[PDB]
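Please produce the structure of this protein holding 2-acetamido-2-deoxy-beta-D-glucopyranose.
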Amino acid sequence: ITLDQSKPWNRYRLPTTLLPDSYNVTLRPYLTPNADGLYIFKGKSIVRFICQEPTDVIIIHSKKLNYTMVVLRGVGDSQVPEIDRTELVELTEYLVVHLKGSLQPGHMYEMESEFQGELADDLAGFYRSEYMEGNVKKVLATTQMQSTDARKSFPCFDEPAMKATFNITLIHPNNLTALSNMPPKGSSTPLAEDPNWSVTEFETTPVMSTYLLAYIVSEFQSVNETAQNGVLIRIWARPNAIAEGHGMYALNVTGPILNFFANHYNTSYPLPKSDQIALPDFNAGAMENWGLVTYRENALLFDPQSSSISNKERVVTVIAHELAHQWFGNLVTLAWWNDLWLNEGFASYVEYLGADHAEPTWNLKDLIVPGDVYRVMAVDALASSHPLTTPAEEVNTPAQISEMFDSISYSKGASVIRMLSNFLTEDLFKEGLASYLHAFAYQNTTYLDLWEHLQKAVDAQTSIRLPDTVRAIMDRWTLQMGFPVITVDTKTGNISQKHFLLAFDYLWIVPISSIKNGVMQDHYWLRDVSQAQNDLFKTASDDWVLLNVNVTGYFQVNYDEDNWRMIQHQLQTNLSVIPVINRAQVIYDSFNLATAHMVPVTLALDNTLFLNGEKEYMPWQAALSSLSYFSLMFDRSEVYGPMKKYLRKQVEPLFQHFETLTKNWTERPENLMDQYSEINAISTACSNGLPQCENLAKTLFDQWMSDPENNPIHPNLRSTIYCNAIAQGGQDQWDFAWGQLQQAQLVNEADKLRSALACSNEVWLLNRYLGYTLNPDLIRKQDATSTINSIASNVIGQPLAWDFVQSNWKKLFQDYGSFSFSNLIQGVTRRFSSEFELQQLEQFKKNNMDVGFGSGTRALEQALEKTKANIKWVKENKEVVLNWFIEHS
Ligand SMILES: *[C@@H]1O[C@H](CO)[C@@H](O)[C@H](O)[C@H]1NC(C)=O
Ligand SMILES: *[C@@H]1O[C@H](CO)[C@@H](O)[C@H](O)[C@H]1NC(C)=O
Ligand SMILES: *[C@@H]1O[C@H](CO)[C@@H](O)[C@H](O)[C@H]1NC(C)=O
Ligand SMILES: *[C@@H]1O[C@H](CO)[C@@H](O)[C@H](O)[C@H]1NC(C)=O
Ligand SMILES: *[C@@H]1O[C@H](CO)[C@@H](O)[C@H](O)[C@H]1NC(C)=O
Ligand SMILES: *[C@@H]1O[C@H](CO)[C@@H](O)[C@H](O)[C@H]1NC(C)=O
Ligand SMILES: *[C@@H]1O[C@H](CO)[C@@H](O)[C@H](O)[C@H]1NC(C)=O
Ligand SMILES: *[C@@H]1O[C@H](CO)[C@@H](O)[C@H](O)[C@H]1NC(C)=O
Ligand SMILES: *[C@@H]1O[C@H](CO)[C@@H](O)[C@H](O)[C@H]1NC(C)=O
Ligand SMILES: [Zn+2]
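Below is the modeled complex.
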């Protein structure tokens, strides 16, 4: 359905003729439904804007708002044109006011409107969340504006670069607390018409993007602390959660992290307070609204009793991430969404800095490697991938904007920034960044503003030298999709680079670390050249070399056979000579190379042989997610049996190691890494049928059922023990776990049960479960997508979920963009390896082509591309893979 752009109201980007100065917004949520089912809110809003250039039309964003139509006033006296007519243009989400005369440049105007909207179970705009306290049902009102939902709350020019000051008022019941970005201005006052309602006015915001606005009406309480910089910190949640002390851990790390960031970047946090609030219904993990940060309960709340170590790492990490946005993205904002990584890439990298400071003994910084680097490479190796910075004119529609919210902007951004930091030295990097923040505070930026400030810092200094300007290096990482594979011929010292695939010509300037028989060598820079030679990369005799120590650069390395064998021999002899992270890398890169058909698949499998004597977290993690792909390809085939037998063989000694160290699973390992390694160990043993593990799970889960009130199972072990107990059992185990889920007060516990229920081997149980997935009384809309994905991951659940998604698609499309919908498509299609399944996917697309795929559109394309690649890969490799596992088991 095309629009003719001759009309500016048919265009997706706002005109540049009018700029907002400030807003007054008054909102009134009605927390009881009217006389059918409907919860609504009422609003009144006034925008003050300046006319930059003459125009006879006023165009602002408005979505799903009903008007009760508008009033235009000149500031003081500028005479003002009369209003001719006023219309809503739905597709493009505009309220359009046609004038009988033109506004004049330099003049200011105020436009006033009253409206009404649904407080939907939407999770977008102004919406309702619900929960239980005792036997009473509670409703609260909350916001999610990013990326373009502000317009769903009140009329505004809803684009990130048009920054304004906001004066917010909330009209709410006497006994409910009203929160916003700023603290309250003075006291609440009774509503004139109805003294049971109160009017709460908030202090003016600093100059700010609309997508950062937040307002909340609830019965929540807080615990509070002042941070070292004088900023007031509060943690808000459900009264029972606060009282049970679930907000304490968040209170411990928040101020310290906020203060760390202010010092590290030499930029003070400008607001008087920063509120953190845990919401029962929320779409993403967390949202960075300036002064009031919103989280899912599982990203904020922590119970040291029933919460996992993973849950705990998730809390500091999400908090750090959200605080980082106070600087990157709030104080300084991207000019437009094609640049999303200037916000998200930065927060994704600095989250690790912040989290490391709050938890210095964890060694978090390493998690960025499996957690960001190798996660995104799988996707960034597609021809359908996109560069960090896409061209502005290619991002227009709301769905295209939501699509920018993918792993490229987050994880590749973080990766590439970690590389930049590493070759600059964070000390130098942070100076450049402080200069960029101070220069651009309360304004917007493009990637070019970033480089120029980094360049300035480099220029002012001597010790660090670059082969080129920061821009020449970074433009190649920023403006072209993908990453190079770097190939080393170890006999001659030839080194080359090639775009890794399943205007700069796909050449990068690549910083290269190396290690020779375990000792550091001089750093090296590969310029943008397809090949070069250096004696750093030449080995003699039995020596070996490894490139990209600690996987600091974003790229993968392939060697000649003989070096590979040397590495392998080293892993058998003393694996400690190789840095633990690079041990993981030899695995990730092996498998990725085998996947892309650039090395025989037996190389990857052979690199798996030493895991025999590996107790460290990361190399196992590398194997697990690498083989995860084989699992997706082969778990329906004859490869599967031998493959499981092999993993049992490899995993067993690690499992025994932990049994002993852990004293019959009574004591938990000391450090985080080792705890992670124990969790992977048990998980792998059970998934693969280690009898000792399956016995453990059955015994423990059985003990739990006979005494529901005391759960015998340590939280770290729960995901694995629940899953396997349910897998081995039947309706009794399932109904028990379901009863636990329905009454569960801790979200972490609920999440573990939700995934475990998806492990049943009975088709009828899984299909019934899918049914529950669409009932909001049973599964909250925010959990529906991940629940369906859990079921799809079950090999027996695969066809159930695929059929369910196809037949429920219309329904699923209206409700459940922002990242879940795309995850649904990706999750159900991961296994398609055959032409028949490919045709199936094509048919699905064709059948639904009318009502589109929305924010999942690009996900569907990548699903198709990958499927095609799987078919070719699976036919080529299955004989070899099968034979290999047979021999080695
Ligand atoms: C909001 O409040 C500030 C401070 O009182 C004021 O200067 C600004 O003009 C107000 N915005 C309006 C009235 O749109
Ligand atoms: C916005 O709010 C402030 C506080 O009530 C007020 O001073 C100002 O007049 C309002 N702006 C209008 C009515 O345009
Ligand atoms: C918006 O108006 C439409 C049609 O007039 C109506 O269906 C809906 O109830 C309204 N939403 C409100 C009043 O919140
Ligand atoms: C607020 O008042 C309402 C209506 O009586 C009540 O349902 C709710 O429990 C109250 N919340 C409080 C007192 O925190
Ligand atoms: C919160 O901080 C206090 C002081 O360090 C501590 O007693 C408590 O263990 C912390 N809660 C955690 C780490 O979950
Ligand atoms: C710190 O920021 C101040 C300006 O607020 C500036 O004077 C100084 O150069 C900055 N120093 C560093 C090391 O970033
Ligand atoms: C975006 O930022 C630039 C400075 O980088 C500023 O001059 C411009 O006014 C900003 N755009 C808007 C709409 O404010
Ligand atoms: C690589 O990482 C380890 C920790 O995993 C660290 O101790 C070592 O110093 C790092 N090596 C380099 C060259 O940064
Ligand atoms: C393994 O190599 C490391 C040095 O990387 C050394 O500390 C250790 O002693 C070696 N182990 C043996 C058995 O030689
Ligand atoms: Zn973010």
